[PDB]
Design a protein around this ligand. Structure first.
Ligand code: GDP
Ligand code: GDP
Ligand code: CL
Ligand code: CL
Ligand code: CL
Ligand code: CL
Ligand code: CL
Ligand code: CL
Lengths: 307, 307
């Protein structure tokens, strides 16, 4: 009974680092870490660095493939100041640390030998604005597939991978809880685009951004642990984000420990968890690499797709 | 507004033949042609031969990619008497000629310079037997996704692509209208496996054979034309297949032209068409190459995925 997958533990996996340089200081690592995330240089060393190696092995390999098609079409051939952008998806639950995995990966990859333009975009920017969600009645399904402008998102990534000189994404503000009027993120023919979001690995009756990925990561953990991380970060944000008077959730700053646990649980129960079960987890099987975290946020197992 | 696709017409496309040899005689082409199919050597020349070229460009390119991963894993490295099998999917409606496109392609590819072992398997063999369909109440959804043992099918293709020495598929008989007791098709580490079926490009909450494809074809035509081909082949089979007294549909041999048109229409309406609309067509957007046929079965346009 064979498998498209091979499973590792951290021991097996860290061996695959080989010679790979560590280009990141502890101060630099700190600026990439999100609230509640526990990544240290050791984890960067034994987990992210084999990963960065595998990826770099594959950027080269994946180029041969667009070369083959261009050759077939009798095409000019790729000027090497402009190869076909490598697209990396990063998926998983709210509160699972996608954010941190993606910023760390971006950092590691920009410190490779040409200094590649490595852009990072979250699908937050492609949420429908609140007014448009209100109209669709989805103000309580923010993060579900249908709360996104998937067409706009597909246009964006398609534009980039097809060699456009610039592409624009809108920009979301967690604080204001909405898309920002007039804000844009401009991506300019990067060598590597990392696209980070809940649902980026979804599939469906139309071509989607998952179909454009040259590599993808799914950041995994036990559902009970992720709820714990989510509730616990909710309590912590009473004195970071919710403390701001502009915070859309400023009213939560005052809640007691237990009032807050109640609130955070009800949101996990009504939104983030059903989304995780119904939409996100069903995409796990396609990910090139699943990074399984233990209750302490520590990546301890990995599942690679060999097929 | 760019696109993952590039569209051709037969003119544009036939130019991409370059030097490619034509290794097939008219007698040989005839034995690959299914009832009602109109393929001539010219179509093989201007349509199939560019296709065989593109594919062969990609077998090489796609090998670099499993090489990259094996290198990463610090693995032995592929002995060249046993590379990673290239998997080709062929999809589309009943009565659209998948059968013929796949047998022709198989033939063209086995006549390449090493003489590659090129196996061809239809998903017919992975239909649940009639007794098991009866029990599920699906005797009138033969061909719908749920009428297949998808697990068994995924095991089969996974086994092959992962380098197994042999793999077994069950075998379906159109005449007897069922899986054949005790029959097996044995596939032995081919260089190229072509997997042909209605739903082979489906996607879903688990890894599927579409996820293993290194290249895929969707054979397309206008829905009205495909119904015409289906009805018309139904009338023709009164004197070929239905004429056999063992034919499961022997009772149809007697029908008048118009009785037969009525019957064939009711089956198209109740089974094959809703399956085409609800399941098959929604997979078109993922195909590497769509081959669009005109009312005369002639492939006149093509849509390639460049991304
Ligand atoms: N201001 C604010 N920031 C939040 C809130 N929730 C999440 N964030 C920020 O959004 C980033 C993304 O978090 P999340 O959506 O859970 O994705 P994750 O990276 O997998 O944890 C996190 O680093 C948080 O800093 C919120 O309620 N208010
Ligand atoms: N004996 C028999 N053969 C059939 C029947 N329908 C289709 N076939 C055979 O099955 C092969 C597959 O046809 P179909 O399932 O429509 O796939 P296609 O290759 O895309 O036309 C065809 O070449 C026919 O020869 C049938 O009703 N009875
Ligand atoms: Cl989505
Ligand atoms: Cl998403
Ligand atoms: Cl809890
Ligand atoms: Cl299927
Ligand atoms: Cl199928
Ligand atoms: Cl008709």
């Amino acid at each position: 009974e064979p498998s498209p997958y091979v499973e590792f533990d951290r021991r097996q996996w860290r061996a695959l680092r080989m010679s790979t340089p560590l280009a990141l200081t502890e101060e630099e690592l700190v600026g990439l870490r999100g609230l509640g995330e526990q990544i240290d240089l050791l984890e960067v060393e034994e987990v992210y660095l084999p990963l960065a190696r595998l990826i770099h092995l594959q950027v080269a390999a994946r180029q041969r493939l667009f070369a083959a098609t261009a050759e077939f079409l009798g095409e000019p051939q790729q000027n090497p100041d402009r190869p076909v952008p490598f697209i990396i998806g990063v998926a998983g639950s709210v509160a699972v640390g996608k954010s941190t995995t993606a910023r760390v990966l971006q950092a590691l990859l920009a410190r490779w030998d040409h200094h590649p333009r490595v852009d990072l975009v979250t699908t937050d920017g492609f949420l429908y604005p609140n007014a448009e969600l209100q109209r669709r009645n989805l103000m309580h399904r923010k993060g579900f597939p249908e709360s996104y402008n998937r067409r706009a998102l597909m246009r964006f990534v398609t534009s980039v991978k097809s060699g456009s000189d610039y592409a624009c994404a809108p920009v979301y503000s967690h604080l204001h809880y909405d898309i920002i009027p007039g804000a844009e993120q401009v991506v300019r023919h990067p060598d590597i685009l990392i696209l980070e979001g809940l649902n980026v690995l979804q599939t469906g009756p139309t071509l989607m951004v998952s179909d454009l990925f040259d590599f993808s990561l799914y950041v995994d953990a036990r559902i009970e642990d992720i709820e714990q991380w989510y509730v616990s970060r909710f309590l912590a944000m009473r004195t970071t984000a919710f403390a701001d008077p502009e915070s859309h959730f400023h009213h939560y700053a005052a809640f007691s420990d237990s009032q807050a646990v109640v609130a955070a649980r009800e949101i996990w129960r009504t939104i983030n968890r059903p989304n995780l079960v119904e939409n996100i987890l069903p995409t796990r099987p396609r990910a090139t690499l699943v990074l399984r975290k233990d209750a302490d946020h520590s990546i301890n197992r990995l599942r690679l797709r060999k097929l």
